[PDB]
């Protein structure tokens, strides 16, 4: 299976995973494929902010589940 | 400090204008300014800052091309200006003066740094609350919702509030602007779940329809998917009622203003389940049950679900009462499917027929009648075959209300006349279209006699009172879409949101007193023109003659088996049943009643014989009697001519009066007195108005020269006079009322005294007396209470309750008071409870609403309930509570228990006080109950008192019951959750004792023993064996038992009986002595003080409206709800998430496996009382929640325990992992809790 | 965690909250432990106001973070 | 010398104490070791709940007796 990731500028990237792996694993993968450090990354799906320690399977993620990536200054 | 700080303030504002030449110092300038304004007040702020120059500089920063990429500065500028006009409301328009709104749109056009966008959206939304149209004026407001799926929560919901606020001030010229945003709000409304997001997207959609219903091309806005989600948003229970009504308001306008999608609402979407699921949310059993469900449905939703279904259908052939005109609705030649189009109607009629049946509001009946004669005109002969039954009885119930129309003056009320005219028109249409199908059933249910009587009545009504005394029969169809815009309402501090303009649809035409008769005479003449046209009725007459014959045997049970054997075959035919009219036509009810109320046979044998024959058709017999009572019902529901409807606004009423003592103060003084309080409180009002001889002036209120006591209400006797007069009640609010009259607060003694001299109102029920008599006989047989509730009487009583003025008037209709006490089985338990609170708890506990603002603001000043803390010690919880009654027994204050040298207060200690005290009333050492007796101290079995010892002292057992009475009475008045364990028989002895003119112990003896084994089966079988062989004297002496009380052999039944043994000489005396002792004279002494103490708080006489088996449940027998589905529906969850969560599924899976003791242990710890409140977890306020609990510091949450913030009401659940450790942890908590 | 909310007169309260308790939940909590209604209370921390829509994790507030409460002058 | 303290699942912590030490000194030192605050800490020995106002020798607790520790709730 695979999932889709949305940035704030609308460009589309494609992944290649299974119903497994963790949020830190996928943020490291996005760092690898885009050069964005994990502290400069924020993930939103189903209108909520994701958790680093949790995995993708616990968030009920299926094939081509189009998630979104968010950039914050933090920024308070 | 202001002058010193000004040289830094103005410098920072200057730096904001210097942001062009200084892109970075302005950052901290804006930060420093925005920080301080948030921590100070506006009145200092207003006198210092040049706000116009502030916003000019901010616009210069936000619009400069140099500082576009200063994303770390644009955030700060937006935040600073947001806090600028957050504190100063009038600065909102100042920004609008220089095109700030168009500037802030540009940022949201393209973003690569969201922390700016979540500030811009959060800020521009706060503009839309004031200048909703100014945002709408720019007209590209689909920008705000393009980035919906990137905003976390607050921005995600503030990007909708702005659009809704700009979607509420819409006018005709903004048609294209809404088309701009509609494609971007359509899917996010189609996929939303948060409530503060679905309560804004419906206000916006309501505002759209409020303005654009006249604009052309309005059919293309609300497309199929959007109206489909609006339809399915009602079929889900979580949607509140307030949004539920709004959704129907949009949906009916989308069927009225157009026809293209009004066709869709009947062809594509399903309307039957649309109506069904909205009603069933208020149901109680999942196996419903349409008839009982509609009783609990609110009237507000009943109005809307009917005024929408009438709009969905095109108007009728003759528009007596409907006032619609719309052009494109004469297309009822389209009959392509007799299923896709007609399966709607053939099962919709069995919906709104019941809506009419179980509702009594004028608007609801009018709407539903209009809908009936609107939809029946569409069906044909083929489609009508399956709808014959319900309509006949419905119209029979409609036009049999003739008796209510006549006034005490002999005059007329137009309200009943409109209903009669509508029913007659429906009858005309059905007889004109389906004569062959409707001739038999109308004759069988007897409508022709009714319409003849109504023709006579219409002829008898006077006509010459016309002011416009030039009336022709053709005054037809005056204004019928001049009347949908005439009253549409909608033509400073900041609110939460901009409320859309309240649309008011009008489909009614008000009928004049002459026009109703003009239509009615012609209608009755017509139906009589079509009026022109079995031996089973003669068999009913033969059965009546047989019952009236005293030659028939009626003594042994062999007689009564044949008494009902013929009756069952006479009434219930293999095909249909005897209607409610034919049963009471030939006097069959009278024939049954005369035999029931004259025969000397005991009630036990009668009940046994009835149950031996009517084994499986008890409800089939109940329905015929209920229909008969509904038709024969003659009681006129009262009304007071309210100008504020059935709400607290009707509590806020006041009337100008000129009180006249039957100087000029006692004869002419215009003062607006509230129409709520009593004559005791009328004395209080005149005492207040005196500001002292007026204090002493207790009056015999001779309003119209009537000696009525002090117990009534300010307008109580006035309203009673205007009922015996039966004048125009509307003038009563305009009349300066000539009130005619002649001449312990320590607790204080509550003003529950409205019914000291009204409980004995023995009102005649007319020809329905026989029906009520055998209904009371049937309920005395101990049969289930399935169909004992009368639909229309319950509806009438509910309509009486939601008239706050009459309920608080103390002039409740005496038929209701008689029917509740005498026949408490015709009403639902909830209705009877509401009747109990209003008739029992006093004005202080009545006018304080709980009937769901400023309407009660003037009423809470005189109708509030007062708190009263009570301080006790834990180790002296029982004994101190005893003196608590002696001091504060009959107070109106809500009890509040406090424990000395302790800080934790609230409902916790209050629940922990009487819950422990009740168990202290289950102690064997007190010698109060039957402790079997054949280890500990507490009684764990069923609970019932023991007979006294006449020789021994008993000064304490009676006193303890006297205290228990005031405890138990105090419990119900405060809706306290108690765990006490009473027996069904104990309250049977209390209902029977307090009922006047009936023996407490039944004179029947085998009824008494059958009532005994519910207390002790050993003695019951011993006694029935004594009865069984009372002739075998060899066996009677084999027991060799003297006249000593069994179990307690120290008490003699009769003097000298301790020596005499049991034989056939005096076995009957032995039986009647042991019965008299264990159930009666031996135990009545407890009861005479129990009721004595019970009536201190409020009289037990009110409690007779309830049942013993429905009092044990409210006192702590009811089994609680613990099923899989019924619990998480009462969860609200949130914060993780609820999904999955694999910690919630198992947490609800464990709570179902609890035994009867684990449940009590967990509930006494989660709540404080060991048992669940009334009606399930719903009554818990608020609902019990599930909240995430993180891991601190590093140890796993699979070791910790479920936390509570000590306000629960709820729980916080740590991340457990394994099922077994969950079972260990939760148990260890619940047992370790106690 | 455990935080401090200080009023304008220096009387500082203590809380037992969690980053999984919204913002409005602690507003309700302070509504329970004192009698100022929620709309007359403004939460200020690190200059920026604490909006009643987020959680404690989004505003980056930790243990021992003494914030101030501004009594809204409606 | 030392005493045994059993955790709620399997693990056991051993602490060096004295008879004169108190039931709140042990709470302070177990907060030093593990980190769980005392308000969520419950000490149980011989079934009865150990009130935290006594000393270790006030209850006459044995050298290697294993008093059970419960992370209590509110």
UniProtKB/Swiss-Prot annotation, chain A:
Changing residue 72 to K: No effect on ADP-ribosylation. Changing residue 68 to G: Loss of DTX3L-mediated polyubiquitination of histone H3 and H4. The modification Phosphoserine is found at residue 65. It is a peripheral membrane protein. The modification ADP-ribosylglycine is found at residue 76. Phosphorylated at Ser-65 by PINK1 during mitophagy. Phosphorylated ubiquitin specifically binds and activates parkin (PRKN), triggering mitophagy. Phosphorylation does not affect E1-mediated E2 charging of ubiquitin but affects discharging of E2 enzymes to form polyubiquitin chains. It also affects deubiquitination by deubiquitinase enzymes such as USP30. Mono-ADP-ribosylated at the C-terminus by PARP9, a component of the PPAR9-DTX3L complex. ADP-ribosylation requires processing by E1 and E2 enzymes and prevents ubiquitin conjugation to substrates such as histones. The record marks 68 as: Essential for function. The modification (Microbial infection) ADP-ribosylthreonine is found at residue 66. Changing residue 74 to G: No effect on ADP-ribosylation. It is found in: Cytoplasm; Nucleus; Mitochondrion outer membrane. There is a cross-link at residues 6, 11, 27, 29, 33, 48, 63 (Glycyl lysine isopeptide (Lys-Gly) (interchain with G-Cter in ubiquitin)). Changing residue 74 to K: No effect on ADP-ribosylation. Changing residue 65 to E: Phosphomimetic mutant that binds and activates PRKN. Coiled coil: none annotated. Changing residue 76 to A: Loss of ADP-ribosylation. Changing residue 63 to R: Abolishes HLTF-mediated polyubiquitination of PCNA. Residues 1-76 form the Ubiquitin-like domain. There is a cross-link at residue 76 (Glycyl lysine isopeptide (Gly-Lys) (interchain with K-? in acceptor proteins)). The record marks 54, 72 as: Interacts with activating enzyme. Exists either covalently attached to another protein, or free (unanchored). When covalently bound, it is conjugated to target proteins via an isopeptide bond either as a monomer (monoubiquitin), a polymer linked via different Lys residues of the ubiquitin (polyubiquitin chains) or a linear polymer linked via the initiator Met of the ubiquitin (linear polyubiquitin chains). This is Ubiquitin. It comes from Homo sapiens. The lineage of its organism: Eukaryota, Metazoa, Chordata, Craniata, Vertebrata. The chain holds residues 1 to 76 of 229 of the full protein.
Curated annotation (Swiss-Prot), chain B:
It catalyses: S-ubiquitinyl-[E2 ubiquitin-conjugating enzyme]-L-cysteine + [acceptor protein]-L-lysine = [E2 ubiquitin-conjugating enzyme]-L-cysteine + N(6)-ubiquitinyl-[acceptor protein]-L-lysine. Gene3D superfamilies: Hect, E3 ligase catalytic domain, Hect, E3 ligase catalytic domains, Leucine-rich Repeat Variant. E3 ubiquitin-protein ligase which accepts ubiquitin from an E2 ubiquitin-conjugating enzyme in the form of a thioester and then directly transfers the ubiquitin to targeted substrates. It is an enzyme of class 2 (transferase). InterPro entries: ARM-like, ARM-type_fold, HECT_dom, Hect_E3_ubiquitin_ligase, HECTD1/TRIP12-like. It comes from the Eukaryota. The keyword Protein transport does not apply. GO terms for molecular function: proteasome regulatory particle binding; ubiquitin protein ligase activity. PANTHER family: E3 UBIQUITIN-PROTEIN LIGASE HECTD1, E3 UBIQUITIN-PROTEIN LIGASE TRIP12. GO terms for biological process: free ubiquitin chain polymerization; proteasome-mediated ubiquitin-dependent protein catabolic process; protein K29-linked ubiquitination; protein polyubiquitination; ubiquitin-dependent protein catabolic process. There is a cross-link at residue 186 (Glycyl lysine isopeptide (Lys-Gly) (interchain with G-Cter in ubiquitin)). A cysteine residue is required for ubiquitin-thioester formation. Present with 7380 molecules/cell in log phase SD medium. Belongs to the UPL family. K-HECT subfamily. The active site is at residue 1207. Residues 781-852 are annotated as: K-box. PROSITE patterns: HECT. This is Ubiquitin fusion degradation protein 4. Its EC number is 2.3.2.-, 2.3.2.26. Residues 1133-1234 form the HECT domain. It comes from Saccharomyces cerevisiae (strain ATCC 204508 / S288c) (Baker's yeast). GO terms for cellular component: cytoplasm; mitochondrion; nuclear speck; nucleus. The gene is UFD4. Keywords: Isopeptide bond, Phosphoprotein, Transferase, Ubl conjugation, Ubl conjugation pathway.
From Swiss-Prot, chains C, D:
Changing residue 63 to R: Abolishes HLTF-mediated polyubiquitination of PCNA. Changing residue 68 to G: Loss of DTX3L-mediated polyubiquitination of histone H3 and H4. There is a cross-link at residues 6, 11, 27, 29, 33, 48, 63 (Glycyl lysine isopeptide (Lys-Gly) (interchain with G-Cter in ubiquitin)). The record marks 68 as: Essential for function. The record marks 54, 72 as: Interacts with activating enzyme. Phosphorylated at Ser-65 by PINK1 during mitophagy. Phosphorylated ubiquitin specifically binds and activates parkin (PRKN), triggering mitophagy. Phosphorylation does not affect E1-mediated E2 charging of ubiquitin but affects discharging of E2 enzymes to form polyubiquitin chains. It also affects deubiquitination by deubiquitinase enzymes such as USP30. Changing residue 72 to G: No effect on ADP-ribosylation. It is a peripheral membrane protein. It is found in: Cytoplasm; Nucleus; Mitochondrion outer membrane. The modification (Microbial infection) ADP-ribosylthreonine is found at residue 66. The modification Phosphoserine is found at residue 65. Exists either covalently attached to another protein, or free (unanchored). When covalently bound, it is conjugated to target proteins via an isopeptide bond either as a monomer (monoubiquitin), a polymer linked via different Lys residues of the ubiquitin (polyubiquitin chains) or a linear polymer linked via the initiator Met of the ubiquitin (linear polyubiquitin chains). This is Ubiquitin.
């Amino acid at each position: 299976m695979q999932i889709f990731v949305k940035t704030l500028t609308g460009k589309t990237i494609t992944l290649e995973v299974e119903p497994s792996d963790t949020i830190e694993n996928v943020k490291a993968k996005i760092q690898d494929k885009e050069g964005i450090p994990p502290d400069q990354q924020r993930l939103i799906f189903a209108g909520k902010q994701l958790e680093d320690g949790r995995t993708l399977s616990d968030y009920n993620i299926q094939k081509e589940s189009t998630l979104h990536l968010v950039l914050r200054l933090r920024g308070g | 400090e202001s002058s010193a700080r000004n040289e830094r303030i103005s410098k920072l504002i200057e730096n904001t204008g210097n942001a062009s030449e200084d892109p970075y110092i302005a950052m901290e300038s804006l930060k420093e300014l925005s920080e301080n304004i948030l921590m100070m007040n506006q009145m200092v702020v207003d006198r210092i800052i040049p706000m116009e120059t502030l916003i000019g500089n901010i616009a210069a920063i936000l619009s400069d091309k140099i500082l576009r990429e200063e994303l770390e500065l644009q955030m700060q500028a937006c935040r600073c200006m947001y806090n600028l006009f957050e504190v100063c409301p009038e600065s909102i328009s100042i920004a609008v003066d220089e095109h700030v709104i168009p500037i802030l749109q540009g940022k949201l056009v393209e973003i690569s740094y969201i922390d700016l966008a979540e500030q811009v959206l959060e800020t521009v939304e706060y503009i839309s609350r004031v200048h909703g149209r100014d945002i709408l004026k720019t007209g590209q407001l689909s920008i705000y919702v393009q980035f919906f799926d990137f905003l976390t929560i607050h921005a995600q919901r503030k990007a909708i509030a702005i659009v809704s606020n700009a979607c509420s001030s819409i006018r005709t010229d903004d048609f294209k602007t809404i088309v701009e945003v509609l494609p971007t709000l359509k899917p996010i409304f189609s996929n939303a779940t948060d409530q503060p997001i679905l309560t804004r997207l419906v206000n916006a959609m309501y505002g759209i329809c409020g303005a654009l219903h006249g604009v052309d091309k309005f059919e293309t806005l609300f497309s199929l998917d959007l109206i489909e989600r609006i339809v399915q948003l009602v079929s889900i229970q979580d949607t509140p009622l307030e949004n539920k009504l709004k959704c129907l308001d949009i949906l009916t306008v989308l069927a009225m203003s157009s026809d293209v999608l009004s066709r869709e609402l009947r062809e594509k979407t399903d309307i039957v389940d649309m109506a069904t699921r909205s009603f069933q949310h208020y149901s109680k059993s999942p196996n419903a049950g349409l008839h009982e469900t509609l009783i609990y449905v609110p009237n507000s939703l009943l109005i809307s679900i009917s005024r929408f279904i009438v709009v969905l259908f095109p108007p009728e052939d003759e528009r007596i009462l409907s006032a619609d005109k719309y052009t494109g609705n004469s297309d009822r030649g389209v009959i392509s499917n007799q299923e896709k189009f007609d399966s709607l109607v053939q099962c919709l009629i069995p919906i709104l027929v019941e809506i009419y049946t179980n509702a009594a509001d004028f608007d609801v009946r009018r709407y539903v009648l209009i809908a009936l004669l609107r939809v029946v005109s569409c069906i044909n002969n083929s489609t009508a075959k399956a709808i014959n039954d319900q309509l006949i009885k419905l119209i029979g119930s409609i036009l049999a209300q003739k008796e209510t129309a006549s006034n005490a003056n002999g005059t007329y009320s137009s309200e009943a006349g409109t209903l009669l005219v509508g029913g007659l028109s429906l009858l005309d249409l059905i007889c004109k279209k389906f004569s062959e199908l409707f001739f038999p059933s109308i004759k069988r249910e007897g409508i022709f006699d009714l319409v003849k009587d109504l023709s006579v009545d219409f002829n008898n009504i006077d006509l010459k009172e016309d002011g416009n005394e030039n009336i022709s029969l053709s005054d037809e169809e005056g204004d019928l879409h001049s009347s949908i815009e005439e009253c549409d309402e909608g033509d400073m501090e900041i609110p939460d949101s901009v409320k859309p303009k309240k649309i008011s649809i009008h489909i009614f035409r008000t009928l004049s007193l002459a026009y109703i008769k003009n239509k009615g005479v012609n209608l009755v003449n017509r139906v009589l023109s079509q009026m022109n046209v079995t031996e089973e009725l003669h068999q009913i007459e033969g059965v009546v003659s047989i019952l009236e014959n005293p030659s028939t045997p009626d003594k042994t049970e062999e007689d009564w088996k044949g008494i009902w054997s013929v009756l069952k075959k006479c009434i219930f035919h293999e095909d249909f049943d005897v209607s409610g009219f034919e049963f009471t036509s030939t006097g069959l009810a009278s024939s049954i009643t005369k035999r029931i109320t004259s025969s000397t046979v005991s009630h036990f044998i009668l009940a046994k014989s009835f149950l031996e024959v009517f084994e499986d058709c008890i409800d089939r017999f109940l329905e015929i009697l209920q229909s008969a009572l509904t038709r024969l019902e003659n009681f006129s529901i009262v009304d007071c001519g309210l100008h504020d409807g059935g709400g607290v606004s009707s509590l806020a009423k006041e009337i100008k009066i000129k009180l006249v003592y039957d100087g000029t103060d006692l004869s002419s003084t215009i003062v607006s007195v509230h129409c709520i309080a009593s004559f005791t409180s009328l004395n209080e009002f005149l005492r207040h108005r005196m500001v002292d001889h007026m204090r002493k002036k207790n009056f015999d209120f001779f309003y119209d020269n009537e000696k009525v006591d002090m117990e009534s209400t300010v307008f109580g006797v006035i309203f009673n006079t205007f009922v015996r007069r039966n004048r125009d009640l509307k003038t009563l609010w305009d009349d300066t009322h000539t009130i005619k009259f002649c001449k312990e607060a320590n607790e204080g003694k509550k003003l529950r005294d409205f019914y000291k001299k009204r409980e004995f109102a023995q009102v005649d029920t007319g020809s329905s007396a026989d029906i009520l008599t055998l209904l009371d006989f049937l309920h005395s047989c101990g049969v289930k209470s399935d169909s004992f509730i009368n639909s229309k009487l319950s509806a009438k009583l509910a309509r009486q309750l939601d008239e706050p003025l009459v309920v608080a008037s103390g002039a409740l209709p005496d038929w209701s008071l008689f029917l509740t006490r005498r026949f408490p089985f015709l009403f639902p338990f909830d209705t009877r409870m509401l009747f109990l609170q209003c008739t029992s708890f006093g004005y202080g506990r009545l006018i304080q609403l709980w009937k769901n603002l400023r309407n009660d603001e003037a009423l809470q000043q005189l109708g509030r309930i007062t708190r009263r803390k009570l301080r006790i010690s834990r180790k002296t919880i029982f004994a101190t509570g005893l003196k608590i009654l002696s001091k504060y027994g009959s107070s109106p204050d809500v009890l509040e228990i406090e424990y000395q040298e302790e800080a934790g207060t609230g409902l916790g200690p209050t629940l922990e006080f009487y819950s422990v005290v009740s168990k202290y009333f289950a102690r064997k050492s007190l010698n109060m109950w039957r402790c079997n007796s054949y280890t500990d101290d507490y009684i764990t079995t069923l609970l019932f008192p023991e007979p006294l010892n006449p020789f021994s002292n008993n000064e304490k057992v009676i006193e303890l019951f006297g205290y228990l009475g005031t405890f138990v009475a105090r419990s119900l008045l405060d809706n306290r959750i108690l765990d006490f364990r009473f027996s069904k028989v104990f309250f049977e002895l209390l209902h029977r004792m307090s009922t006047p003119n009936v023996t407490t112990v039944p004179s029947d003896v085998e009824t008494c023993l059958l009532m005994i084994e519910l207390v002790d089966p050993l003695l019951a079988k011993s006694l029935k064996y004594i009865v069984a062989n009372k002739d075998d004297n060899m066996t009677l002496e084999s027991l060799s038992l003297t006249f000593t009380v069994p179990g307690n052999d120290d008490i003699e039944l009769i003097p000298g009986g301790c020596n005499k043994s049991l034989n056939s000489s005096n076995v009957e005396e032995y039986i009647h002595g042991v019965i008299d002792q264990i159930l009666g004279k031996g135990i009545e002494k407890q009861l005479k003080a129990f009721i004595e103490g019970f009536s201190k708080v409020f009289s037990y006489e009110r409690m007779l409206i309830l049942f013993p088996d429905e009092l044990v449940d409210i006192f702590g027998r009811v089994e609680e709800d613990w099923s899989m589905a019924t619990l998480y529906t009462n969860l609200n969850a949130e914060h993780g998430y609820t999904m999955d969560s694999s910690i919630i599924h198992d947490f609800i899976s464990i709570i179902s496996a609890f035994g009867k003791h684990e449940r009590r242990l967990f509930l006494q710890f989660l709540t404080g009382s060991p048992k669940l409140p009334i009606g399930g977890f719903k009554s818990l306020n608020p609902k019990f929640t599930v909240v995430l609990k993180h891991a601190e510091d590093g140890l796993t949450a699979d070791e910790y325990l479920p936390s509570v913030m000590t306000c629960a009401n709820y729980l916080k659940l740590p991340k457990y992992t394994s099922k077994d450790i969950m079972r260990s942890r939760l148990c260890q908590a619940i047992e370790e809790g106690a």
